Amino acid sequence: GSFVEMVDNLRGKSGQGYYVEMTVGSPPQTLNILVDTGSSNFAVGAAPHPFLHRYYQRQLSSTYRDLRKGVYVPYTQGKWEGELGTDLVSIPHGPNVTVRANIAAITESDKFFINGSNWEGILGLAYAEIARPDDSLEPFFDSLVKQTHVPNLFSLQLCGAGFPLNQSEVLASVGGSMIIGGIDHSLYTGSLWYTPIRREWYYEVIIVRVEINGQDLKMDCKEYNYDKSIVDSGTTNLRLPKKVFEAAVKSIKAASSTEKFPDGFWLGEQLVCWQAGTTPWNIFPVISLYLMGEVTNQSFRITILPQQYLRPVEDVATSQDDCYKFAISQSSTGTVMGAVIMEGFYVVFDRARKRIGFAVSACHVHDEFRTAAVEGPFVTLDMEDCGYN
């Protein structure tokens, strides 16, 4: 399986998001759209905004259809307001098809757009159950599969550079691949291991065990999925439930105790720098998340390195030091496997078989001593009890 036309069709970074080019309307209006497996709405800027240098102009599209309905999407971290309608949509570097899908024309927003991100909209790839205003608004991917012969599946390879990318660099660099309707074998190494999609709303999965450098965090596995665990490319960090986060930071601190870092670092707020090339990767532990497998009483694990959970950021002085921010934070809405984590793997969203596959990414950052991994199987009992109800 190889989809050369879709390989390397993404750009961006964990801190500002990964996006793919799309066109909307007739004549085609090109827009960069954030790939988000954590939401289910296709929404684009449709009015001037200081952070946008282009937006969807409905009056210029002959195929625009007004649904005469508004949609308000408030989140704890931000919000966007829009007007619903439909239009013809295509993905230049994707399947050779055009479909009529729902589009939320964003007219008002609060902390939605990111200065310098280079994207003007968002592509919610999750299910209708969480679509705004309600599940009657068919998500883009659903329209795509229903209107074409494209297989009900997509895979994502998000590629973190391992170092800071400046304004021009991030615009020229290849940030990864989104293969629509298939799996490209050149994007990963080793085997793919699948965990079931527990329920079709967010891409929900179940974590059954957590290790820090092989040491079991030893918590009731229900804590790991309280109140849910999801794969969300729309979130930067690996976010863990309060109690799990507190235990993990204690363990990570213990493992890296040869060097002390200020509280602000562990709060993911302030950066830490080291002289060029001297980042002490080896003092930081690897983190393993065991996921439910498709076989009864069987599980597998994905292991990430500090190269994944330490996010490269530019120093205020733009010096030659190598700096990073701690990309693991506290959550009140369950575990969130954000961009940070996805960068270590090729992730297959097998909608058709209700499962998510993980394989070591061909573009994950590592060193000569350790590598990310996807290994199995392991015998694990009562994994169903790890899920929250």
Place this chain on the structure above:
Amino acid sequence: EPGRRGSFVEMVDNLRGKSGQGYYVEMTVGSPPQTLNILVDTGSSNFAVGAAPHPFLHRYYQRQLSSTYRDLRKGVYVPYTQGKWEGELGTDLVSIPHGPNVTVRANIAAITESDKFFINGSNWEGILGLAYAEIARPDDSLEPFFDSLVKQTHVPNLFSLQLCGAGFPLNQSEVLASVGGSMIIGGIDHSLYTGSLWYTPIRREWYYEVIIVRVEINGQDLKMDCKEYNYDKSIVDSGTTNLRLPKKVFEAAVKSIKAASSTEKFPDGFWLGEQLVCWQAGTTPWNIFPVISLYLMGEVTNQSFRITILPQQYLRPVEDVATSQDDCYKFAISQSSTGTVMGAVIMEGFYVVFDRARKRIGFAVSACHVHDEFRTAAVEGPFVTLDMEDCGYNI
């Protein structure tokens, strides 16, 4: 209890006008004195008067007729988004007939050219900028009138304003005969307010800048980062008609106000503050509109207070295009790209004390605020509020 006395009778009721065209006070300039009506503006710092013929002016400052006129041989250009005026700087003897019994020599910008500055039928021929020197044009070396007044006399460094909206439209004849409020120069008149005065600090001395720490619509917290409320600043400006809010705050507020008043549907033009809405005489549904509360930083650490206005304040009375017997209004809240602006609309609900001496602004329920039998404007406190300093904006 104890009844509060009014000690500045000579200045009480010395204002005229309305929110839409501004409130003004009578002043005299030159020798012999030339009488002119001057717009009271806490949003600027220049004393400028028409000094040449203009279609909307019935009179103007005639420098050649004043024996005390002094030419500063300097020009001044004051452009704004909504208008501009140009003039020639100089000084002369100035007085306020219904104010302190003193005469001082102050700077006067003789307006020779203007665009969209003078308003037809406002009845004022000049402006009195009461803010600080930092925002004076051309620069802070041009001492503002109030500074001159305080430096040259024994008048206390403080003034208070009671702007009185009528609650209904006033035609040309009526607005000329009606008392529009009071400007007490050098003191506080207790007959102009009820309840207690609560003070918020003047954050910085340029505009009369304050800090809003919380906003509620009918008791419901707008729940925005308080920094948003003061982006990029929050000021008290009698020279502005509406309550203006930062874009994001306006969007959130209008949505909440719409939700609270949802039993009635209004056209987009209304919410944009552009078109009026009318109801049969006496049937304005005040009760369906929410009260709005703005919490301000108090003078005591971690303490705040709130001022609450009614729709009687934020819905501005306007005459129907058909001069019918309907009661009509325009929505007097609009967005801003220059921070929050507590304009005349809001000031009409309170007696506002500009305590320059103690770098603070006091608020109290106005004795002339419009209300109904069920609700009244209010100034209440104290409330425990933490990290209020973080609400202030810094470039």
